[PDB]
Scaffold this active site. Structure first.
Site, PDB file in Angstrom:
ATOM      1  N   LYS A 183     -21.212  -7.567  -4.892  1.00  0.00           N
ATOM      2  CA  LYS A 183     -20.648  -8.273  -3.748  1.00  0.00           C
ATOM      3  C   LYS A 183     -21.112  -7.646  -2.446  1.00  0.00           C
ATOM      4  CE  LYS A 183     -16.566 -10.308  -6.033  1.00  0.00           C
ATOM      5  NZ  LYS A 183     -17.096 -10.208  -7.434  1.00  0.00           N
TER       6      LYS A 183
ATOM      7  N   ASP B 248       9.398   4.026   9.904  1.00  0.00           N
ATOM      8  CA  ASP B 248       9.981   4.580   8.686  1.00  0.00           C
ATOM      9  C   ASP B 248      10.732   5.845   9.051  1.00  0.00           C
ATOM     10  OD1 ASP B 248       8.246   2.771   6.893  1.00  0.00           O
ATOM     11  OD2 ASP B 248       6.865   3.790   8.252  1.00  0.00           O
TER      12      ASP B 248
END
Ligand SMILES: O=Cc1cn([C@H]2C[C@H](O)[C@@H](COP(=O)(O)OP(=O)(O)OP(=O)(O)O)O2)c(=O)[nH]c1=O
Ligand SMILES: [Ca+2]
Ligand SMILES: [Ca+2]
Ligand SMILES: [Cl-]
Ligand SMILES: [Cl-]
Ligand SMILES: [Cl-]
Ligand code: NA
Ligand code: NA
Length: 326
Positions: A63, A183
DNA sequence: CCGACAGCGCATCAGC
DNA sequence: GCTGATGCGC
DNA sequence: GTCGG
């Protein structure tokens, strides 16, 4: 971004495999390959060159050769033209809509932002909030705003109980100039691996942040993990800040270092480190590092007095948070 | 070739 | 109601 | 999709 074209292609393939194909091991393989290519410090000239990197194999190499030759990937060009794949890929961008729910919505003819807004009665609570803030949750958070958010959270937590410690983790702790969301790692001496001497430790903090209009919505909430929505205050005559995703994790205080290692990430870094831990005969989660016995059963937690201790067990040189953005 | 792929909290559901 | 599987998320 | 053994 020496190889941004390749890594964007691999990320799009990963998202296709996760959202459409529901092939989680392909998702993870593409993400792993994208990560190793992203840190490779040369502009890749061939798929053969890339195949030397661990996690890039024959198919991704081919690819990469197509992409370098043509600037495109026919496989992705077709995926982009496929209506069902495109619809599913879009719906999963709403928080709470995963691959299964997206395909079910497409089956019912719910496939555009407009369709969702007309069918709020068919969304669960999480999905309804994800739709409400769809545009806002797309936006990144500048570090300057993360610092204001940190100030609010650390000061409001102190007002509840000065023995709480709140640590902002994720990409912020890795020093990133922008973050996807906030977070927060929370500890309190009353909650250890040996006992819970106070109830509602997480709840009281969430309540205080709601009281000051910082937390605006809740996606999910339990005794140790909060997932929700927050928003900075704005000044007179100013446009409002976008709503932001916030995660809060209450971790036993004596397990802080395993917890801050996990919550600092990145996610691929954690996967690399935990996979390496296994090859070394250990298992790491957010609480402990444990030896694996001859049968594969995790043994008793090993003593940990620093993040570096965890690195030492698995024979890794210590890496500062800023070097964990894999 | 083929087993294994990091590890886990909260929401939701079927089965009972 | 509980338990275990699943979905989704970190 | 990739890899160790
Ligand atoms: O969400 C996915 C996963 C997350 N984690 C850990 C490690 C990660 O750093 C932290 C917070 O998760 P975020 O999604 O907020 O990721 P950030 O690194 O903060 O990047 P953003 O700047 O917010 O995009 O939780 C995993 O261990 N595994 C995951 O699968
Ligand atoms: Ca984050
Ligand atoms: Ca997060
Ligand atoms: Cl798969
Ligand atoms: Cl393409
Ligand atoms: Cl544990
Ligand atoms: Na390789
Ligand atoms: Na989603």
């Amino acid at each position: 971004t020496l190889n941004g074209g390749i890594t964007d292609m691999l990320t799009e393939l990963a998202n296709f495999e996760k959202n459409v194909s529901q092939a989680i091991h392909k998702y993870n393989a593409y993400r792993k390959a994208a990560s190793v290519i992203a840190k490779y410090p040369h502009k890749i000239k061939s798929g053969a060159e890339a195949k030397k990197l661990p996690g890039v194999g024959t198919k991704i190499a081919e690819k990469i050769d197509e992409f370098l030759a043509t600037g495109k990937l026919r496989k992705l060009e077709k995926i982009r033209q496929d209506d069902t794949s495109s619809s599913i890929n879009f719906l999963t961008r709403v928080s709470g809509i995963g691959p299964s729910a997206a395909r079910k919505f497409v089956d019912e003819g719910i496939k555009t932002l407009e369709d969702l807004r007309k069918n709020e009665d068919k969304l669960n609570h999480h999905q309804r909030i994800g739709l409400k803030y769809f545009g806002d949750f797309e936006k990144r958070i500048p570090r300057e705003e993360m610092l204001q958010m940190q100030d609010i959270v650390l000061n409001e937590v102190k007002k509840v109980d000065s023995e709480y410690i709140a640590t902002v983790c994720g990409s912020f702790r890795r020093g990133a100039e922008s973050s996807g969301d906030m977070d927060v790692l929370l500890t309190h001496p009353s909650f250890t691996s040996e006992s819970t001497k106070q109830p509602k430790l997480l709840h009281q903090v969430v309540e205080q942040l709601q009281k000051v209009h910082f937390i605006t919505d809740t996606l999910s909430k339990g005794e140790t993990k909060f997932m929700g929505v927050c928003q900075l205050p704005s000044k007179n005559d100013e446009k409002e800040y976008p709503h932001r995703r916030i995660d809060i994790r209450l971790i036993p205080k004596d397990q802080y270092y395993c917890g801050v290692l996990y919550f600092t990430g990145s996610d691929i870094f954690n996967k690399n480190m935990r996979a390496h831990a296994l090859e070394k005969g250990f298992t790491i989660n957010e609480y402990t590092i444990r030896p694996l016995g001859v049968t594969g059963v995790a043994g008793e937690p090993l003593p940990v007095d620093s993040e570096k201790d965890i690195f030492d067990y698995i024979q890794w040189k210590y890496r500062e948070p800023k070097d964990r953005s894999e």
